[PDB]
Design a protein around this ligand. Structure first.
Ligand code: IHP
Ligand code: MG
Ligand code: MG
Lengths: 359, 507, 151, 538
DNA sequence: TCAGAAGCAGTAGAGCATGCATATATGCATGCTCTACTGCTTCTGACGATATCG
DNA sequence: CGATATCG
């Protein structure tokens, strides 16, 4: 907690804190006195990633020690293995210079553990180990990237593991594994070039499903993953001419159905507007016969939701800014603005200004 | 009660003048006898149950060592697991010069208050950081009326003993040899919890329980714990929860511990597999399983060898019933387990269990089942032989009620017997053998034999821990004692030999 | 929630509404009401083991709190160790130590809280002055001047 | 101790008839032969087998010259079985149009046995037959076959699609009602005659069905090797003793070939090194050698160094090769629920002398008449730990022996106190529940009284079914060796059907099961089935 | 040949923490660690018979 | 029969 409070202020004591953490991890046996011993080291490494203190930490020796511990037939508890995998993944991110000779070895370890935990027909999975492996992979792929245009096998099996992680095949109660999978997908979606361009339908469906979840961190992770996926797919469909006839019309139909739907809160409308922008921007497929359509739709919905509906709008005020941002994003696109919808707009902005103290 | 509960025992030995000077014919002083008894209990408990708590407290001394600084009360050892060093510390006072060592270290012959002694005992009982199943204080003294010429201290001690007994502390009396005579009816009749109903008269010697405590019984005791909580499946719908218990388990010596010869401390063993050529470490995900048959080489993953040996889910699938008349006694494969209902996973299992037990007992039928103890385990066929409880020895349960899980061997477990001819014997020979068998018959008890190797290992460990160079040799109780069997049969052996053997024959 | 560590600075030998870590050495337990956030450690195995090894430690609370607590089967082991105290009745509590025969008297007064059945206040008076513990109370404006025992 | 055996399978058109609801007899014979050859291969026992296919389209036989022995093809000579024969049986065995006869097949099998076992030493020679008996044959060569079998000491077994719904190996009548033709009838008569004329009446019991042969281990009956004798002396006192030989009659049968640890990339085991390193529990983790470690035990929270040499010189020394009777007692005071061991010993007499035989027979009969047992003191050799056990008489119509089962010591007894159920007022069942359980038990009876003498005849002989784990391992190894990149196949239907009672018992117990369900209430607290990772992340 | 000894994996039984929403109370459920015990698999070595040499 | 070295 103290390192979280004063991050960079602990300049001289970092080496001693790391030494004490390593000594507690080595000499002690209880996991309750061992999980914090690795959490503090992870916080140290995340706080001093760019600082020059990464030379006295001996990242190479630490990685060697933890890898030798991994190669032990004696099994450690599940909760500490998660932190071990997370730390091993972080070791490649904060100091990749000393990890060029070990990233290829660590990727095989991560892939084997993920396959053992997600392709086991004789034993139940271990969700903490899964979340740890996912976070370690998301932290290791930051520098030692593996794209489809570099090596297809690894970049495809990683994508399949991410799919199976974010796949709601069996609904659970803890969301650590799907949250880590969504964060991994959001961080490095630019590597799975041909992967996301084949199962894009199921990807979009599951991302829309997770973006409406009741959780907050899971919602943010799903939103970031959906934004990255939409950006990548829009780039791929706007760069070449063979992706238009299927993907362009599919995504345009999806966005139009999301927009013209009557039961769709501000989240889906904003997502549809952002996707339509990111797609029709570079693709140069904008047609005023539908931009004006979605503009009139948004204006009528805002009018029937905020202006005419003069009732107990407990949540409407807390979502009016998103409606205004979407309306502005749409209005900036079309060039022939209907003059009949200018009052509704001016009065709408006036009433939004009036609701300022309620925020 | 609880599985995690352990036992606690506090040795309370007096240190008055009568404890050191009672040698009528110079055989054993009451203090030396108490030290011998305490050492015997320590030795017998350090192997049987090494997780119990023992404490030795001396009262009536001159010095004092307490947590509340009471007077004339010295706590030598607190409630902890019995070790070898405490045995030596008690040995410091065992010998005759041990009495002088005691009187120079702690002193003797002083006044005391029996209330403060019980208070220190309760304080020691209240410092335990584990659950205690039984709390017992054995008082080693030779004072039939300790608080003489004073009634206030006697009433205070009686009130404190009542408080301790209300707390749940067993308080028995181990009276030693009193010269004039030890009568517990004076004072200790109202102190102890239960009276043995035979000490209405007076005693002139040691107590009858000291000889019981001096017999060092070395046998590791294990608490009751089910091997597995399976589910007897009378059908895909009718399922009841039963507990599998083992009543006969092979006793094994404790496994050794790798040590550092210099500091005599345990070392940490870390097995590790790596490539011999490159030198890089190998994880289980980077390893396959092979099995070479001739020229071929079958390659299988790690998790596939478990698929090879899995058929169904763990539990007891109920097959039909079979009479006991067709269950051969020579069809033994594994030691028989014990089935008993749990009434904790499913509600209503005990009633159906008792019904099945009664119906199988009155019909002497054995419910055949398919035994799968753990996940990914090949199934075995077992017959749930019904067992009726037997209440003997003034209503003491010697056999629990339930079913007897008996393993049945398969076709390949039975081996082939070579062909031989049945040569029989004459009625005279069979009658002679019957007579010589009736001459040597006896009564068998299941607990009449001991494992000689295990007992010898215990004796050797004691000799190496206590640093005594005279290791006790445990007499082999499994020997037939041929030096006494021939004296009973008499001259039947040579007659039977001449009857069934040729004139000249080399056996 | 209850951010209280069940230990007053003036009287550290008594713990209120908390029996988790350092309150296992207390000489007297007090329970304001029967809410779960004020009953941490009341069913702990360590406290269960301590109760069966002592005779002078008790749990003081309102009679309604005692009725609500003894009804639950998980807390029925306190049946012989709970001493209910009437409200607005100054009683003397003996903080006798178990190990040593030391003793200490303190005067406690239970005041109504108006929160839930059995909710009361604790007003202690001893050598270190007068302290007040209003655990989850509810008083309207102008009612503090109507408490007889606080005047 | 090798043993010759020639498999004679019929590949005629007769067995190729697709009966509705039942697999073809050709398929059942293929299953039986596959099980036989796979248990012969994976056991790695020195043996040579031969396969003679008769009733095929082609013709290949050493005596085929002269328009004799047509449609007889020796598909495999007397050689060690391997994966080639497995591939042959699995894939490239196809039915034939012409129907040959089993008599000329027996002739050519004798020919192979007597012209290929020349330079080899075989203590046993066997011939198995897989026919349908629905083909034409003659009656002339029967006496010649009988004489050649009695002079060459050849053992024979016959396997038919029928015994003397339908589930393959499901403990039920394999023969279809009224499905035996007159040709099959006369074939049955002649085969019963030829089996009786070989070794007596017991020869008729050497005729098994196809489904019957899959869950009885009968094909390995005349080729298994006998046990190793343990020569010792059964002493009574200091002088009286009896020369005895003891064999292991029942023993836990486990696999003999372990699973080698090889590298993932290189399938060679030499590229794997298992190193064990010892280190102190310190911060620096100083490495410790191997010669500076002393063995030590634990003695009451302490550690006492007990070196190997000190443990050896102080170890309990006993006189090995001893078997002395401690005494005698009634068989009623020693129950089988206290048996503690892993193997059963049958104590037989000496090898050849008759005096020890008569003495042991007298001992057995005396122990039987007095219904008493003989507690003995058994020890395998100088190093084995001494043990006590029961030695009760086992009298049969063919042999005499003493069965030995080890007894537990004092440290092996555990006194667990369980609550009583007879006076369990919280769980005492009602009388209607007792009647329902009675009906269920009487419905689920696995024994029956037949032949009007009212003798017991169990419908589920679990003591004769082979271990299914061995067959599963064999079929999985075969599938992986013949299909290098494919998932493991599921459990075959006959294996999963031989581990179940006959369907008649289930059909009769359907109603009592629901009746038990009605009265007895069963409420489950929380069902959390352990689902594997594949079922969650498919 | 096979008994016995390591070495490893699974579970019972206790115990504890946290996650629960706009509640300040949840108590409630759920999921994890720990430890001693049992069982299976792999490995080893002494040993006794019986083969061979004198 | 010695008694030595295998071989399981
Ligand atoms: O082959 P079965 O006719 O079915 O009967 C056999 C046979 O006993 P019988 O010849 O007296 O009927 C076996 O005797 P052996 O061949 O082993 O000498 C006997 O063996 P056990 O005495 O050891 O029980 C046991 O067969 P198995 O060895 O498989 O148990 C038994 O079987 P049934 O009692 O079921 O008829
Ligand atoms: Mg509260
Ligand atoms: Mg409250």
């Amino acid at each position: 907690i103290f390192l979280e409070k004063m991050g960079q202020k602990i300049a001289p004591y970092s080496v001693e804190i790391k030494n004490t953490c390593t000594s507690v991890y080595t000499k002690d046996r209880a996991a309750k006195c061992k999980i914090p011993a690795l959490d503090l080291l992870i916080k140290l490494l995340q706080t001093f990633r760019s600082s020059r203190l990464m030379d006295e930490f001996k990242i190479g020796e630490l990685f060697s020690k933890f890898y030798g511990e991994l190669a032990l037939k004696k099994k450690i508890p599940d909760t500490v293995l998660e932190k071990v995998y997370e730390l091993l993944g972080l070791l490649g991110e904060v100091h990749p210079s000393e990890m060029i000779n070990n990233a290829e070895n660590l990727f095989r370890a991560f892939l084997g553990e993920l396959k053992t935990q997600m392709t086991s027909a004789v034993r139940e999975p271990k969700l903490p180990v899964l979340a740890g492996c996912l976070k370690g992979l998301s932290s290791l792929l930051c520098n030692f990237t593996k794209s489809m245009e570099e090596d297809p096998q690894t970049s495809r099996e990683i994508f399949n593991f991410v799919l199976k992680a974010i796949r709601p095949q069996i609904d659970l109660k803890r969301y650590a594994v799907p949250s880590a999978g969504l964060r991994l997908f959001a961080l490095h979606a630019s590597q799975f070039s041909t992967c996301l361009l084949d199962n894009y339908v199921s990807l979009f469906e599951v991302l829309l499903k997770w973006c409406a979840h009741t959780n907050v961190e899971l919602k943010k992770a799903a939103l970031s993953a959906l934004e990255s996926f939409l950006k990548q797919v829009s780039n791929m469909v706007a760069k070449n001419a063979e992706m238009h006839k299927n993907k362009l019309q599919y995504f345009m139909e999806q966005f139009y159905g999301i927009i013209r739907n009557v039961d769709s809160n501000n989240k889906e409308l904003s997502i549809a507007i952002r996707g339509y922008g990111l797609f029709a921007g570079p693709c140069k497929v904008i047609n005023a016969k539908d931009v004006d359509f979605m503009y009139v739709e948004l204006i009528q919905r805002c009018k029937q939701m905020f202006l005419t509906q003069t009732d107990t709008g407990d949540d409407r005020v807390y979502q009016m800014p998103s409606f205004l941002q979407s309306v502005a994003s749409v209005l900036l696109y079309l060039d022939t603005v209907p003059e009949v919808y200018t009052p509704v707009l001016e009065h709408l902005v006036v009433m939004q200004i009036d609701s300022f103290p309620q925020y | 009660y609880k599985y995690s509960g352990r036992d606690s025992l506090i040795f309370l030995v007096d240190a008055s003048k009568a404890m050191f000077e009672s040698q009528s014919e110079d055989e054993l002083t009451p203090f030396d006898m108490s030290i011998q008894c305490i050492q015997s209990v320590y030795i017998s408990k350090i192997i049987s149950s090494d997780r119990d708590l023992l404490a030795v407290v001396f009262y009536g001394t001159e010095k004092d060592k307490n947590s509340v600084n009471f007077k004339n009360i010295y706590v030598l050892q607190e409630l902890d697991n019995p070790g070898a060093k405490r045995i030596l510390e008690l040995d410091q006072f065992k010998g005759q010069q041990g009495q002088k060592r005691f009187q120079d270290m702690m002193g003797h012959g002083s006044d005391y208050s029996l209330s403060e002694v019980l208070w220190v005992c309760a304080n020691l009982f209240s410092d335990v950081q584990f659950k205690m199943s039984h709390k017992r204080i054995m008082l080693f003294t030779n004072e039939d009326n300790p608080h003489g010429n004073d009634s206030a201290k006697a009433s205070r001690a009686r009130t404190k003993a009542g408080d301790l007994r209300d707390t749940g502390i067993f308080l028995d009396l181990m009276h030693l040899k009193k010269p004039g005579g030890f009568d517990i009816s004076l004072f200790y009749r109202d102190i102890i919890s239960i009276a043995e109903d035979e000490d209405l008269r007076v005693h002139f010697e040691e107590s009858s329980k000291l000889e019981d405590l001096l017999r060092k019984v070395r046998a590791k005791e294990t608490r009751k714990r089910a091997l597995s909580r399976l589910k007897l499946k009378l059908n895909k719908d009718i399922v009841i929860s039963v507990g599998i218990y083992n009543l006969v388990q092979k006793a094994l010596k404790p496994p050794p511990i790798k040590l550092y010869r210099e500091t005599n401390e345990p070392v940490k063993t870390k097995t590790r597999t790596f490539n011999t050529s490159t030198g890089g470490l190998l994880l289980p995900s980077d390893t396959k399983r092979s099995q070479i048959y001739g020229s071929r080489q079958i390659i299988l993953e790690k998790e596939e060898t478990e698929e090879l040996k899995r058929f169904d889910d763990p539990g007891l699938m109920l097959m039909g019933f079979k009479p006991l008349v067709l269950l051969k006694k020579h069809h033994y494969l594994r030691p028989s387990l014990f089935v008993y209902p749990e009434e904790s996973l499913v509600i209503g299992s005990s009633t159906l269990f008792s019904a099945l037990l009664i119906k199988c007992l009155e019909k002497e039928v054995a419910a055949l089942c398919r035994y799968t103890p753990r996940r990914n385990i090949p199934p075995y066929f077992v017959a749930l032989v019904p067992q009726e409880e037997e209440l003997d020895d003034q209503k003491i349960q010697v056999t629990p009620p339930g079913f007897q899980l008996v393993f049945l061997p398969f076709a390949d477990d039975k081996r082939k017997m070579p062909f031989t001819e049945k040569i029989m014997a004459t009625p005279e020979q069979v009658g002679k053998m019957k007579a010589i068998v009736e001459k040597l018959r006896f009564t068998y008890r299941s607990d009449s034999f001991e494992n000689p190797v295990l007992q010898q290992h215990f004796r050797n460990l004691e000799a190496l821990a206590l640093d005594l160079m005279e290791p006790e040799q445990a007499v082999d109780l499994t020997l037939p004692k041929v030096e006494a069997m021939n004296k009973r049969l008499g001259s039947l052996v040579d007659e039977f030999k001449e009857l069934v053997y040729p004139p000249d024959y080399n056996p | 929630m209850s951010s209280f560590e069940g230990q007053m600075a003036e009287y550290p030998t008594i713990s209120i509404d908390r029996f988790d870590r350092e309150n296992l050495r207390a000489r007297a337990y007090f329970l304001s009401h029967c809410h779960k956030d004020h009953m941490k450690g009341l069913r702990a195995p360590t406290l269960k083991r301590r109760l069966e090894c002592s005779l002078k430690v008790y749990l003081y609370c309102s009679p309604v709190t005692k009725e609500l607590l003894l009804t639950s089967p998980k807390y029925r082991f306190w049946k012989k160790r709970i001493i209910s105290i009437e409200i607005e009745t100054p009683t003397q509590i003996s903080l006798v130590d178990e190990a040593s025969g030391e003793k200490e008297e303190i005067v406690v007064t239970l005041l109504p809280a108006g929160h839930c059945p059995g909710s009361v206040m604790f007003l202690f008076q001893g050598n270190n002055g007068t302290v007040l513990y209003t655990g989850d109370f509810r008083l309207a404006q102008g009612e503090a001047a109507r408490m007889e025992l606080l005047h | 101790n090798k043993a010759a055996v020639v498999l004679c399978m019929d590949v005629g058109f007769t067995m190729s008839n697709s009966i509705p609801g039942i697999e073809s007899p050709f398929e059942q014979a293929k299953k039986v032969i596959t099980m036989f050859v796979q248990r012969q291969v994976f056991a790695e026992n020195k043996d040579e087998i031969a396969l003679v296919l008769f009733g095929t389209d082609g013709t290949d036989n050493p005596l085929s010259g002269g328009d004799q022995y047509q449609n007889i093809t020796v598909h495999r000579h007397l050689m060690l079985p391997d994966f080639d024969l497995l591939e042959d049986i699995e894939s490239k065995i196809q039915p034939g149009s012409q129907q040959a006869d089993f008599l000329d097949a027996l002739i050519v099998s004798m020919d192979v046995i007597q012209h290929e076992t020349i330079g080899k030493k075989f203590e046993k020679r066997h011939i198995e037959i897989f026919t349908d008996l629905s083909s034409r044959f003659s009656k002339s060569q029967l006496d010649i076959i009988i004489h050649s079998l009695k002079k060459c000491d050849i053992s024979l077994q016959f396997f038919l699609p029928f015994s003397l719904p339908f589930r393959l190996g499901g403990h039920g009548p394999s023969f279809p009602l009224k499905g035996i033709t007159e040709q099959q009838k006369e074939g049955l008569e002649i085969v019963k005659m030829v089996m009786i004329s070989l070794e007596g009446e017991d020869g008729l019991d050497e005729i098994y069905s196809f489904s019957e042969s899959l869950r009885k281990l009968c094909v390995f009956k005349k080729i298994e090797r006998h046990s190793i004798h343990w020569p010792c002396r059964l002493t009574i006192g200091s002088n009286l003793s009896i020369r005895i030989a003891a064999y292991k009659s029942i023993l836990q049968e486990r696999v003999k070939k372990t699973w080698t640890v090889v590298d993932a990339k290189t399938l060679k085991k030499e590229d794997i090194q298992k190193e064990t390193v010892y280190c102190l529990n310190d911060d620096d983790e100083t490495e410790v050698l191997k010669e500076d470690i002393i063995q030590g035990f634990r003695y009451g929270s302490d550690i006492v160094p007990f070196s190997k040499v000190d443990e050896e010189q102080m170890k309990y020394k006993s006189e090995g090769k001893c078997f002395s009777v401690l005494g005698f007692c009634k068989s009623s005071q020693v129950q089988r629920r206290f048996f503690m061991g892993n193997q059963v010993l049958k104590v037989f007499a000496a090898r050849d002398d008759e005096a020890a035989a008569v003495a042991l027979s007298s001992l057995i009969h005396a122990l039987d008449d007095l219904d008493m047992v003989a507690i003995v003191r058994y020890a395998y050799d100088k190093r084995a730990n001494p043990q006590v056990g029961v030695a009760f008489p086992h009298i049969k119509h063919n042999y005499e022996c003493l069965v030995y089962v080890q007894l537990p010591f004092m440290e092996d007894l555990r006194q667990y106190m369980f609550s009583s159920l007879k006076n369990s007022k919280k769980y005492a069942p009602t009388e209607a529940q007792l009647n329902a359980v009675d009906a269920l038990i009487d419905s689920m009876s696995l024994a029956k009284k037949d032949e009007k003498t009212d003798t017991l005849e169990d419908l589920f002989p679990t003591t004769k079914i082979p271990n299914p784990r061995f067959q599963r391992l064999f079929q999985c190894l075969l599938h992986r060796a013949l299909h290098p990149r494919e998932p493991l196949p599921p459990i075959q239907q006959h294996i999963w059907n031989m581990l179940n009672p006959p369907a008649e018992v289930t059909t009769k117990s359907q109603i009592p099961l629901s009746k038990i369900k009605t009265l007895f209430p069963l409420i489950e607290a929380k069902k959390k089935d352990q689902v594997t990772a594949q079922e969650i992340f498919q």
